[PDB]
Task: structure prediction
Amino acid sequence: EDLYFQSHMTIAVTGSIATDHLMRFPGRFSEQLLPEHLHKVSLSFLVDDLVMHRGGVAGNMAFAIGVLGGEVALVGAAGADFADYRDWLKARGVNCDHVLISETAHTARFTCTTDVDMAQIASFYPGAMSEARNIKLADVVSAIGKPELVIIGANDPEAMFLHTEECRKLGLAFAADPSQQLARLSGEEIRRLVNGAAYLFTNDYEWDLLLSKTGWSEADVMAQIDLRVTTLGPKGVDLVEPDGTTIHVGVVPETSQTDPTGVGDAFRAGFLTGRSAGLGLERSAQLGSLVAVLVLESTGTQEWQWDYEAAASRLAGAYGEHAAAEIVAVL
Amino acid sequence: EDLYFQSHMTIAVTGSIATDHLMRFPGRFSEQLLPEHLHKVSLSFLVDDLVMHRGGVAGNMAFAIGVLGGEVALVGAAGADFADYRDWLKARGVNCDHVLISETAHTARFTCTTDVDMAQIASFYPGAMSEARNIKLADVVSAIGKPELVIIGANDPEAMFLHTEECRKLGLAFAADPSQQLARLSGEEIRRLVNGAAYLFTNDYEWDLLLSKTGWSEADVMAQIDLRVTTLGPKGVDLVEPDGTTIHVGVVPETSQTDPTGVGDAFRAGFLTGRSAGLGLERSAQLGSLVAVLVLESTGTQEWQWDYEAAASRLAGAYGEHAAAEIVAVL
Ligand SMILES: Nc1nc(F)nc2c1ncn2[C@@H]1O[C@@H](CO)[C@@H](O)[C@H]1O
Ligand SMILES: Nc1nc(F)nc2c1ncn2[C@@H]1O[C@@H](CO)[C@@H](O)[C@H]1O
Result:
């Protein structure tokens, strides 16, 4: 129980800040991946496209919360080049005061290849991200008050745990969102990010990976968190309570599958924005699913637009008139 | 039957010319790759290292042939930046006169991630490589005479077929070395690169991929080529005749597994250098296996050194005194 003043109703987004290089492979990764050679892959994809966009899970989530009108602070480490990216985020209402700017290292670089089925294979070079372990959430809280929620996104692995530990000692609600880092983190490293989480967000592959590496059963996890949110690709999203009462929300149907980078980030930002505005779980995931498909339909993670009238119409189309009106009249 | 003069005894190396960005993932790709999610991977590897080196299969193979004292012409397409890379290759005796230099596009970029087991996942952005389809082997042959062998390495996909067709009409012996491009090429595209090949080079994963995508059986392939050369990772290499008489040569034992990029290229260059100097199949693969391990033990594809005394000693250690003396006294 923390006695410091409430920031109300700020979300602090911790996680990576990067430049994304996105490329397309005009074939199927699946069609390359012989089950008997998966022991030691040797894969090389000739790509037909290369474009650069602003990225990082924390930049992506902060951007979307800001577009949706939310109060949001971005907390992460970037290189000296961050000034321009800061202007882009500030233009959508993102508070960038607490971004650590490295004196010597470069903003992180994500290099990603997407195939015809929206499968993705990517590397992430941390650069200045590694200095996120030097950021103190206590100093952020000192300046802006207690956030209603701290999102713990993929980050410098040590920073992910330090931030989570700080939330636990400061009594801040947090969302465990280790998604993009699950590959790098040991089972021990994953296990220590989970206990006491207000929300755990993953996709279903990531959920299997988590359980696979933690040695946990679903029951072991559900006993430690307030809510599991597991996106299911074209099958929508499951929201599961410790009970486990399950609410399911199907996707908003896409007009294209352009580029799936940042779709999870957008779902999380829309959903949490919904939750912050007092919408229930079903309605929050419906708003999330819309921001998600808007990202899927654009190239890059922050290259989507927010048209209030177009949103209501689409929400109506997929979820009906009640959902649409409840959502739009919360924004 | 071509009546033009012999270049004697030049190898023309066709294939890619690039800058390689090599990174290391301090984990296991296998441990990430759930058999039930291989239908649509979502993989992202936080890397702990990023270094840049000269690359491209044709640059790598030309470099090695030149280091070994062979006469070699490099034939491929590069950007205006190629002048510096040209000096590096020329320093090892590589003829770069027939490299097409793009007026507008950039030298190709390879971005590669290697895990603790030497597995590798990579993208390749072609840039100027796409202009290789405009190179005429006839003009190269015009200038330097008929090569004893043209290597058809991974390249602009259309260029790989055009070059092969030119070899077929000019009556030039060729080695089909589609390795790195097998992922991008359709079964139809692979099938038209094979007929009449003096050598077909792949690793065993690539051999399975080839057979998988061509719809061919091993017998279908062996009926069209003079020799199949299939590297087997730590198990060495099989050299198989249409018969199919098989010669097997085990690896030269490594002192490190540093970086496996370019190991296949080096094996091919050493082997073909052996063949050009009148060594038999077994002895040529023994020389190949040595250049291969020298690459494995260094970072980058062209960052290995050639010490004549160290070579004899190592060859002696793995293959015995006869092999070593026969090989060294051919160079
Ligand atoms: N391994 C990773 N670690 C961290 F910290 N961030 C990563 C990783 N992989 C992808 N990203 C970022 O996530 C994407 C959108 O979800 C992109 O915007 C990208 O910048
Ligand atoms: N898909 C590909 N297409 C082409 F033409 N070249 C590629 C590809 N993947 C890797 N490389 C190059 O091969 C490596 C060494 O074998 C490296 O030096 C690298 O430059």
Q: What stands out?
A: Chain A touches chain B through 54 residues (CB under 8 Å).
